[PDB]
Symmetry: T
């Protein structure tokens, strides 16, 4: 269902938001500043995903998550408790999460288009395009 | 301790951040728009408290929270699971949490100044003043 | 026909454009300024719908309406002769016309896609999303 | 009467506003782009005259027209059913209507100064100068 | 005399300037923020009226008031000594003072044109229109 | 005739335009830079009356001057063949010419209002006001 | 395949990019400035098509063209060896090339949607809409 | 008491606010324009002190002055009834009043810090520093 | 001599400045607005050549012209007494004068480099380049 | 010949423009992002060189290349057929191409000054300096 | 005395200012560009420190250093006579000097508060926080 | 030698940079504020020559001065030990040093042109012109 897929993204966005803050704070090594800058941009864009996806559930007449307790249980992304990272561990860590979200937004688009919900479908397709490009930049950067 | 007071603000900030999104999404009534805008300014300003205090913990040579699991357990702020709000009851809920944060930052200033950490105290004093101004506006609006 | 749906939207837009000027001028009560501001943004956005929809008719090789007499006869939105309004009256009036526009744009999108006209469908899908969002906000404000 | 003249300008502006969209959409020939841009600048200026005179009627304590049906009966300016124009027709059509608006605004200034309504006369004199300038520019372009 | 009207407007501006600060500080109730923000706009506009009229007296060759003691003695606007207001009280008080200013500026325009001082008359006609627009909005807001 | 008054201003503007350049280039003494900056502002503003005044003559259906030979003959402003100036000499010179233009714009406004030419008169009343303010400031500076 | 259509657009874009520079340099006649300004915006837009289209090939895991030699052998758009043009046959030339790109992007969208590549299709639908708008405007100018 | 120091600053600010207007209007001599611009920025900055200090009293739970009658009787800054000044007397008058304000803000910082009111003390320390910078600059200019 | 050439450039600039105003006011035909706006930019750029050249003569330790009487007798550009122009004739008039200024500036550069005056030569070389670009564009539009 | 050197730079710029696109797309390794940004700006300055030199050829009365077939025949920059690069590789490749362009522009400057074509020499001297700065920075980066 | 400590900071600031220019010019290695940009911001911010401290000395009624000869003597920042550095080397040098400025600013704050000079202490505390944040970032980059 | 003249300019720029801060801090008298600001603009411009000139040495393959100890021994501009200046003394201190820099940049241009180093000569000629203009202004101000 379109709504249930939206709430999965919502719960995963809020966990990824914090996970990316940890990368932002605890990155080590010579390119500390560029990764410090980039991670901050990532969690700001997923703060926007967090809000948009939730408000879209509201426009569709349902209830998004409103507690971190429920978002933690619902989330399929794993929290990161370690507190020191080099730049390429973070690129690898973010790349895997991008591929999970890409699968998630690809399903939302296919499912919304089958229900004739082209608005939810259009939103997913733009995020699909944004992720495919970021993914290709990371696989090139880790090459 | 300065660090353990900062980490409390950190945990409560992240819970307050989500609670205010719920007010943002689920406010009803004639004053839907100003409340929808005010709440958004608030969670953007507490996203900044969340990051500032965490990095200040980092500059003092200790570790902040890096997982939502730890932040929920540490947060004294109560999550709000109900999902429909009148405007006045958002002003009251927000006023009460502001008074909790005000008490926390005032102790942070007193504790940091004890220890000669005037930087942490200066930061806390700014938020004390910002909270005192906002708390006084809410009291006038609810009067 | 895609063109007939576009031209219906054009005629209803031009009638809605004037009606909202009336709400803009004749709102009474303590919410005068917020309503006076919001109505003006509404008619400026429908001035743009009026113009976009007309030239899309021309890019498809047909003629849009060019006279007020033809648009008044074709419009299903009805004019408002009352010259004094309460603020919740205006929100209710605007909510109803939006749902009419939402249905008009959904049919334009569905019909345009069925003919392989993905450009017209894409334009309509943008307006469906904007109308779905505003309707949720208007329903929340009257709740 | 000042209000009668203002409400006459109101109706004729609404008719001219749509007529200039027709010129805007259906100009043909080599000077298409400059004419396409000039016509759009003209209907945006008359959207502003439309709102200004209507609001001026209200601050003088009376009611302007609020329906397109009422403005078409009051409008002295002919609607235009033709659907294709060369660039010199449009400059001729616009010049003819500008001279009509000039007489109308000159009468408003004279009547308003009779009644000691100097703010209404001042607004009218500003539009008289704007019309006298554009009229002189159109005569040079047609010379 | 033109300068006596300017100096009277000058004195009444200075008292109204402080009075509006009192409304700005002590408004209570749910419409706190819009009134808090409108009142500040108002007292900055009368700060500029205070300076404009004073400097115009100087261009006409006499002296404006230069002490608060004389401004209180000369003013006809009355000071507000209570320290708590709801939003509708403030609106009714500003409307009453605006109508007083509108007569002062209308008389200034009338007298200045009778003497051939068209510059002073034009300045007053500008303030007359601003008051007439603001008055209409307040009457609508209290309706 | 308003035209003959306008063209007189035209001729005097262009002569004063060059005279002010001489003050700009050849000011001596410690106030070099404020006077150097002020004279440039002055001649840029009179380049503007030069063009505005000619275009109005054209909108009234007559011809302005089109050669320096004709303007130099028509001009009453005297040219300055001295090539070195003290800062107060410049202030004195500008003040004398400003009172000449003020007389000219007052007579232009008086005459245009006699014939019902409110546009030309409104243009002149603004220049009367700008000169009265500038004249006052110059008198204070030389006082 | 989507990729081989994307790469075809890439090759034709680079030839069209240089062809429009030739028009940009060698247009003659009284309309020199607008077409000179117009062509520069066209080749700046196809530089952007050139880069967008190639990067999408990479996000799809393939290689775009990387040499001018390969793109020349692949482009179907004809090079222009003539070295002097009037304004109308530049418009006819751009109109003909726009209709070729339009078919290409329409094919690209149809193939992308067939395979479930909604991102590539969304990009193509944008270019289809922009070409349809420009084609309509070119036909009006050549009418 | 901190509020008693705040309310004294408020009363003296409003009196000083007007006195500087008198300096602004009636400065004579060669340095007219720099002093005119300087006094305007001084009185606009004390208008801001006036409002800040008053709002601080309200956040501390007390009432500031709300009438010019009370502020005149509380003020210690003497009003200036003279209407003509050279530039150097204005600098002397402003220098004397600045050291009076400096002593007031210094006492305010001392009392607020002794009572643990770090917020009002921080505000006072900022004005103390700004007054010291302005005091030093004025002493150099009068040297 | 460099000063000789600079003062000749000075005199011809001031006459051309007014001539281009005549073209600006008195162009007729369907290209009125492009020619109206283009001619204005020309005279604003020569107003600056006028000032640059005069100030450079001053830096070289001699005196520029300071009266229109002196510049009129020195100028070689001829004044234009006709008061009605077609677009093509304005272009040809401007092209002929541009080739004169180009000559003049090429002689200034060559002469300045002889005596080692690289600054004057560098300014001249920039004007040579700007005129060569403009001359080629004018020849293309006249082809 | 100045023109033959300009046309050579033109032909090499067009090949270098594409080569740098290949570097832009296919850079791999840790330093993916900065190189992706750097290569894109590089090709944007050479798009500007491409247009400037061609327009300078036209100002000299000769014809630039207008065909990709002729430019690749004339170009001496080797095309790059590889599709995978680390950042150091790209730096060494660009450095070699910069040193070639540097000899082209120094020879261009030397020839133009020989013939008295100081405009072409100054354009070349600016490009020589820009290349010398970038060459120094690349040698520093490869050190 | 706070003044000696301000003057020590002044002398070290000017020596640090030049040393950072040296790092700015002579960094080598694949990380030239980020370091070149970062060093330029450091020396511009220490130019601001150089000026603030000197002006703070003067407001305290003392004299700062005014010659490089005296500042070289007093400075404890060591000059660097090497002309080639890798990036890690520069970060080490900058981190060591930042801990020196941090110590230096901490004593300034403590001693200024001892004398009730809260203005000097507040300025120093701002610098302590800026240095603590930058030091944390440099330690992470060298980690 | 070009490099030898460049590093001489570098050393004198760094000494002049500090001397002008001394003028900036220790100016006294009524004309305090313009002089405080002009000196600030001057030392910021010589900070730019300091960096430009050092970087030009580097791209010519040499090392500039890198320590204040070396720059002090190379500088010919004398340091200033006095600590108080009137504005007329500063104006001629600056004029004398400007005449020195003018000679230095002039000889740099001549030497660089002798070596075919036209980039260094163009930069020097730009500084020669900027100095020639300022020297003309200071002489007029001291006249
Ligand atoms: Fe939101
Ligand atoms: Fe952060
Ligand atoms: Fe349009
Ligand atoms: Fe309105
Ligand atoms: Fe003022
Ligand atoms: Fe004009
Ligand atoms: Fe790209
Ligand atoms: Fe306030
Ligand atoms: Fe100038
Ligand atoms: Fe170009
Ligand atoms: Fe400073
Ligand atoms: Fe640099």
């Amino acid at each position: 269902k379109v709504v249930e897929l939206l709430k999965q993204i919502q719960a995963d966005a809020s966990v990824f938001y914090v996970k990316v803050h940890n990368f932002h704070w605890n990155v080590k090594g010579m390119d500390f500043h560029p990764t410090h800058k980039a991670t901050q941009e990532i969690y700001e864009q997923f703060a926007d995903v967090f809000d948009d996806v939730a408000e879209r559930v509201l426009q569709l007449g349902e209830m998004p998550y409103v507690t971190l307790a429920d978002m933690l249980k619902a989330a399929k992304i794993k929290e990161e408790s370690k507190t020191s990272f080099c730049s390429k561990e973070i690129a690898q860590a973010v790349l895997a999460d991008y591929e999970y979200f890409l699968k998630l937004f690809t399903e939302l688009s296919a499912q919304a288009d089958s229900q004739g919900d082209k608005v939810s479908a259009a939103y997913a397709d733009d995020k699909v395009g944004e992720l495919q490009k970021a993914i290709w930049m990371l696989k090139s950067q880790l090459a």
